[PDB]
Amino acid sequence: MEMEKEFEQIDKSGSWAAIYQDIRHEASDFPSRVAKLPKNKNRNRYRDVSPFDHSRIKLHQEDNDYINASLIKMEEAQRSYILTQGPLPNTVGHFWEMVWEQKSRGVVMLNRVMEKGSLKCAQYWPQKEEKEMIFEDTNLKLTLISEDIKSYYTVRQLELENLTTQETREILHFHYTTWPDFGVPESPASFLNFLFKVRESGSLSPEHGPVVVHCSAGIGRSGTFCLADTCLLLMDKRKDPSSVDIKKVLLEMRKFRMGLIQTADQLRFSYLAVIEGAKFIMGD
Numbered sequence: 001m002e003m004e005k006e007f008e009q010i011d012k013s014g015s016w017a018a019i020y021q022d023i024r025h026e027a028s029d030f031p032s033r034v035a036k037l038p039k040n041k042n043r044n045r046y047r048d049v050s051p052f053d054h055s056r057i058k059l060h061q062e063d064n065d066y067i068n069a070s071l072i073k074m075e076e077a078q079r080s081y082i083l084t085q086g087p088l089p090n091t092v093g094h095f096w097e098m099v100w101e102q103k104s105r106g107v108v109m110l111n112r113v114m115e116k117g118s119l120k121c122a123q124y125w126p127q128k129e130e131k132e133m134i135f136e137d138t139n140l141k142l143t144l145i146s147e148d149i150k151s152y153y154t155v156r157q158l159e160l161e162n163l164t165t166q167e168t169r170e171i172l173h174f175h176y177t178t179w180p181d182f183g184v185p186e187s188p189a190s191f192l193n194f195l196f197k198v199r200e201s202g203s204l205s206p207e208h209g210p211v212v213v214h215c216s217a218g219i220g221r222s223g224t225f226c227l228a229d230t231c232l233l234l235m236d237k238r239k240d241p242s243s244v245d246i247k248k249v250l251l252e253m254r255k256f257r258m259g260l261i262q263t264a265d266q267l268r269f270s271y272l273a274v275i276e277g278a279k280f281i282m283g284d
């Protein structure tokens with residue numbers, strides 16, 4: 001069923017809450033035993049948001065390999081994403097170790113460091129060229145190279161150096177800065193524009209490791225970003241673009257990380273972004 005018609009049918013019936021609950025009910029449940037070990041309690045921002053054991057990213061160190069991060073592997077779309085929480089004061093070194101080890105090109109950040117008067121994630125990148133950051137626990141150095149501030153998002157060019165081998169890499173930071181403190185954006189125009197800038201960069205392409213995507217918990221806004229990208233890619237690839245079922249793509253993605261799309265409003269916003277992005281697709 002053409003999702004645009006499914007959309008009006010749910011909107012006119014105001015059933016968004018009922019669809020969302022159907023998804024919650026059918027979603028996969030897999031063990032998260034590593035995440036719940038007592039040694040890992042300070043590595044988790046939220047007690048109810050954990051990576052599944054089967055899909056968790058492992059850090060390459062014998063001490064403790066745990067990070068709150070999952071690999072979302074979309075077989076038919078041929079895209080992979082790492083979804084993670086906003087780093088904590090004690091996990092900023094782990095975060096950059098993961099970026100290095102997984103060969104990521106891009107980091108996508110969908111939150112502000114402070115929102116609703118509380119800290120949503122650590123200040124994990126340098127704000128001034130001449131004040132670089134050193135992560136002593138993981139032996140990495142990170143320097144701000146350049147910053148492009150726009151009305152709805154900022155792009156930063158960063159150098160990550162593995163101090164053990166003196167190899168360096170270019171890391172692009174895509175920072176969506178205008179998601180509102182409550183609800184979802186009214187128009188998906190600026191969010192789609194942002195997604196197309198990440199794509200244009202090469203960050204989502206198979207020649208690099210998976211893009212690292214985060215918000216505060218790494219399930220809500222983060223879930224919207226990867227669901228819209230995968231759905232629009234499948235509409236490009238298939239003979240019948242109307243076959244793309246957003247609810248079935250979301251349940252496939254929920255096999256890899258729990259709780260992706262946190263509200264009925266986020267589900268509705270995901271439909272809108274795909275419907276409008278297709279509009280700027282069918283003939284753009």
Ligand SMILES: Oc1ccccc1CNc1nc2ccccc2[nH]1
Pocket residue numbers: 145158159168169170171
């Ligand atoms: O390590 C890298 C490898 C390839 C590309 C980018 C980087 C980041 N570092 C960096 N220093 C610069 C100095 C002048 C102009 C561009 C620069 N990019």
